[PDB]
């Protein structure tokens, strides 16, 4: 229950306007450019402020490539059927910067008519105090526009694995 | 899936307060004069600002009669059982005018006690990038007051046909 | 369908926050003194402004006793098991008065701990243009506190009968 | 029906944003620190202002230990698997104080990463006028964080027993 129950809470934390029930194979969806932007930026802002939000026993974790914070990738048709992959890494200092210069980068000027998808990925670490067992949560938020139907499908994927209790930082401690 | 999935997105784009599920044979309904006005004007305003809203690969299309923009028709009992049909054509320049003089025309001074229906019709063009196939969407928004029961039923009808890829303008490109 | 469909519209017009589906044997309910007041005053205000709200082919009708406007009755335990019935008649001039002095009467200083129920009753007249047949709607809004359980159950009752087409006044004509 | 129907009304009165239907074995839930605080403080504030809210025939009652008002208890892991229980008693004078100094106590500086649960308990007295029978309601609001899953489950428990009609004070009388 610990890993599965944390996944539900992550959907409520990171998916803007999540109703509490998945729409279909995806958690929720958007139909406008404004709502797509607001959902992407909400997920990033909730990650940035996670210590003042979460009710769990969690902390930030390093990614698979040792980069810290969020990896934001996007796929879009090249200007001229070829698909181009672009990624940006937003660490904790990037997200805490004032002005938050990362929001004005060219990466976030999305061209929805040729955008296939946006993916946000990050790791969280959690401790199961009720049993202690430490988990690494590999989280991915996918903004799927591959159908190009006017609807973006939003998925929250979380793979959790038991790991050694090494990372000390738990939010609120 | 492309034409059918675009129809769902059109309901979210053009029907004010659409819950995401059709009420019955119609998509949604209104019970007040204020809500009837707000739903009609919302559909027109969403069409006017479509390039900054849609997540799809769409553009405006010409109507069957070569008129551009929206055709708004209304049916009402004549002043004196005979039904009178009145139509107005709102092109892109009409909708972009400041002040938007079209909103103050006598056509939009509705008399609900004798109004049978209001119909908004327009064409959109779309490209199925996932497969390319070009579609013409013949859209009709019907505000049905024929029951005169205090409830206006709102339908969104879309007939989509495959056509030659001739029109160049796709929103955001 | 005409009389039954008008009843649905009346629930949307006169019952504050009506969800569109009846809760149980009653249409909706309230759990606070503020919400009870707001629902009662909303029903009265919607009646007062009915000509600028309804989408139907309706007009005001005289009551069974020839009094015009709304009859508001309340039942409460006497100060000292005996039930006392008090009524007020709010005609169209009472509801249009500025200040609306009727709202400050002692009748509307409700004592919820001993209040059994509040009843609002009025007649509306309607014409079935689709077929013409004229209907008299005998409407009653009941705020039922007889259980004294902390929940007021709100019912909308409408009995409609075919009558001669004599009354001329239809809202918006 | 009297005791059971009052329980439904208590859920609407004391549980912030209660939808009217229990989520599962609990009435509702929260996923953020802000929402946890807002739900706890709402329950206390609704108790404090109960005379201007309830539609029932109720009054405040003494607790099992003769203390008046609310007992708020919390369970949390000690700083250094041992569980510590801390309680505060908020009487009617504490809740009516300006500034309400009770809100700034160290007790209400919650540490969610080690918080097991928060419990609010109080008694209400009610009279069944429809039949008179007097009831004592032993109410408990539990904010359950024992899973440490990121979700706090909120329960409303009410045990009601018939007692002698001795307490005079009924709200609004
Ligand atoms: Cl935008
Ligand atoms: Cl892009
Ligand atoms: Cl209006
Ligand atoms: Cl008209
Ligand atoms: Cl009040
Ligand atoms: Cl009263
Ligand atoms: Cl907070
Ligand atoms: Cl604590
Ligand atoms: K998984
Ligand atoms: K069709
Ligand atoms: K009836
Ligand atoms: K019980």
XYZ file of C-alpha atoms in Angstrom, chain B residues 42-103:
62
model
C -19.006 32.279 -25.709
C -19.252 29.987 -28.795
C -18.722 33.047 -31.065
C -15.858 34.430 -28.974
C -14.107 31.015 -28.867
C -14.335 30.839 -32.685
C -12.980 34.402 -32.929
C -9.949 33.563 -30.683
C -9.508 29.908 -31.931
C -5.806 30.327 -32.927
C -4.864 31.106 -29.238
C -7.050 28.295 -27.835
C -6.980 25.109 -29.877
C -4.366 22.398 -29.135
C -5.127 20.796 -32.516
C -3.736 21.172 -36.050
C -6.598 23.280 -37.409
C -7.419 26.355 -39.415
C -10.535 28.266 -40.453
C -12.398 26.992 -43.524
C -14.818 28.550 -46.032
C -18.504 27.654 -45.718
C -20.552 25.779 -48.390
C -21.769 29.149 -49.825
C -18.088 30.635 -49.917
C -18.912 33.053 -47.049
C -16.175 33.205 -44.393
C -16.620 33.057 -40.626
C -19.843 32.146 -38.840
C -23.389 31.918 -40.060
C -25.836 32.624 -37.197
C -29.474 31.833 -37.943
C -32.528 32.081 -35.789
C -36.100 30.852 -36.105
C -39.005 32.551 -34.363
C -42.772 32.858 -34.676
C -43.756 35.898 -36.775
C -45.350 38.905 -34.949
C -48.919 38.047 -36.087
C -47.902 29.642 -36.277
C -45.819 31.101 -39.218
C -42.023 30.676 -38.557
C -39.552 33.368 -39.714
C -35.871 32.509 -40.491
C -33.278 35.327 -40.089
C -29.511 34.903 -40.636
C -26.380 37.026 -40.168
C -22.860 36.296 -41.355
C -20.044 37.203 -38.980
C -16.690 37.127 -40.786
C -13.267 37.396 -39.118
C -13.182 41.248 -39.604
C -16.659 41.619 -38.014
C -15.514 39.652 -34.922
C -12.188 41.584 -34.671
C -13.873 45.037 -34.917
C -13.613 47.363 -31.875
C -16.293 48.141 -30.774
C -17.675 44.735 -31.879
C -20.769 46.324 -33.508
C -22.193 42.897 -34.469
C -23.207 42.256 -30.777
